[PDB]
Amino acid sequence: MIQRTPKIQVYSRHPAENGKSNFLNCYVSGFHPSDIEVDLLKNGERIEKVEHSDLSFSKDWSFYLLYYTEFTPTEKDEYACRVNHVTLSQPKIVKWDRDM
Amino acid sequence: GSHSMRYFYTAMSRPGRGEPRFIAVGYVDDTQFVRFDSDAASPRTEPRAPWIEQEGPEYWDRNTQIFKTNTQTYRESLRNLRGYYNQSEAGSHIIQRMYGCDLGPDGRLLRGHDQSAYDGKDYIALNEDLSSWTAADTAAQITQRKWEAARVAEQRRAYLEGLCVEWLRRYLENGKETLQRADPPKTHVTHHPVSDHEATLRCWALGFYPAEITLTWQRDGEDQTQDTELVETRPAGDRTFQKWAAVVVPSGEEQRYTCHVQHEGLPKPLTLRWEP
Amino acid sequence: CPSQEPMSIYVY
Numbered sequence: 419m420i421q422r423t424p425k426i427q428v429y430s431r432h433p434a435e436n437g438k439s440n441f442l443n444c445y446v447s448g449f450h451p452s453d454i455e456v457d458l459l460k461n462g463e464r465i466e467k468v469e470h471s472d473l474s475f476s477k478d479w480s481f482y483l484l485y486y487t488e489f490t491p492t493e494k495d496e497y498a499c500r501v502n503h504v505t506l507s508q509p510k511i512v513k514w515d516r517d518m
Numbered sequence: 519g520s521h522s523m524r525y526f527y528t529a530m531s532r533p534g535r536g537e538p539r540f541i542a543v544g545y546v547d548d549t550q551f552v553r554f555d556s557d558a559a560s561p562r563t564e565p566r567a568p569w570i571e572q573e574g575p576e577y578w579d580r581n582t583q584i585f586k587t588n589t590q591t592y593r594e595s596l597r598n599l600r601g602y603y604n605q606s607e608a609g610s611h612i613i614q615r616m617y618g619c620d621l622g623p624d625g626r627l628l629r630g631h632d633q634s635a636y637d638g639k640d641y642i643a644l645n646e647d648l649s650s651w652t653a654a655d656t657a658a659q660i661t662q663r664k665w666e667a668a669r670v671a672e673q674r675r676a677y678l679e680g681l682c683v684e685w686l687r688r689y690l691e692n693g694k695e696t697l698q699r700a701d702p703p704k705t706h707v708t709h710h711p712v713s714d715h716e717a718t719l720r721c722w723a724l725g726f727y728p729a730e731i732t733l734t735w736q737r738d739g740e741d742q743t744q745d746t747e748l749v750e751t752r753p754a755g756d757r758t759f760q761k762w763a764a765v766v767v768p769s770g771e772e773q774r775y776t777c778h779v780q781h782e783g784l785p786k787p788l789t790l791r792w793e794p
Numbered sequence: 795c796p797s798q799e800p801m802s803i804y805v806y
Contacts, residue, residue, distance in 0.1 A: 450638040479635045595806035677797040685795045
């Protein structure tokens with residue numbers, strides 16, 4: 419211990435089309451130990467009903483989880499995922515970029 | 519093609535916050551099909567893929583008993599490993615276990631697996647012979663001696679060569695419309711000017727299953743390995759996966775670059791270029 | 795289907 423910090427990706431299930439319902443994903447991976455906090459944000463505010471996958475791990479023993487919620491992207495609304503883990507001194511914010 | 523079944527167990531101590539939590543999940547290839555969580559309100563094995571739902575009550579009862587027993591075994595094991603490493607009662611620790619069977623394209627056993635880690639570091643593993651162990655350190659040597667005394671390897675071998683393969687072959691048949699269907703990636707190249715004399719070319723692969731994919735950039739037919747940014751393959755949430763690879767190129771030179779895509783679902787490998 | 799594992803055999 420020997421701890422590993424999460425990789426973080428924030429992206430949509432389907433190509434983003436303003437006004438079209440979709441799914442907002444935050445994939446955290448490569449982390450150890452398994453305890454981790456992940457919030458999805460809409461314009462800086464925490465989205466309420468976010469679901470996640472069952473804890474599993476990769477061949478190198480590092481954990482991964484997918485957090486997701488339905489969302490309808492628009493031109494103005496900003497989305498992000500906020501992650502905290504023991505390896506992090508402060509939460510990490512990764513904004514949703516529809517190009518990534 | 520080839521196929522595998524795996525169970526992944528995670529046991530996590532948390533002194534002061536109750537007994538260690540035990541989770542088990544089961545996969546066939548990149549598709550999860552069962553879960554168990556000792557922290558659930560009423561812990562029981564629950565289906566996570568539609569093709570397993572048809573299994574009867576005895577199946578679910580067998581699974582649940584097995585995982586409840588494991589919950590108690592892993593609690594003892596965490597106490598044992600704490601001892602082997604002279605660790606305090608204060609800290610949280612994790613044992614992870616993986617095991618299962620790999621089949622070749624013909625349905626034959628290719629090899630079996632059983633490996634464990636403690637706090638994310640390899641601890642002990644069943645060798646490919648399904649007979650002997652590799653222990654990482656003098657603590658794991660204690661486990662090895664215990665398992666050698668109880669003839670664990672012989673029991674592992676029996677399961678891996680028998681029930682493991684038998685049940686995997688069943689699941690593959692019952693879930694044949696999905697587990698034995700490769701969905702090729704949808705692909706395209708995007709262009710993002712960075713400055714006056716550089717642009718990013720990003721190659722996308724979307725909607726594919728299974729997760730295995732190769733996605734490279736070439737310049738003049740030469741691999742651009744060091745210069746390519748390659749994101750980890752990521753789940754879309756609908757069973758499929760996504761990936762991209764990006765290269766920053768000199769303005770005007772975009773056409774000396776090709777994106778190559780290899781995936782089971784493809785009638786043939788793709789060669790893509792930016793199409794202004 | 796997971797392997798049946800008695801505690802007296804499989805404990806670490």
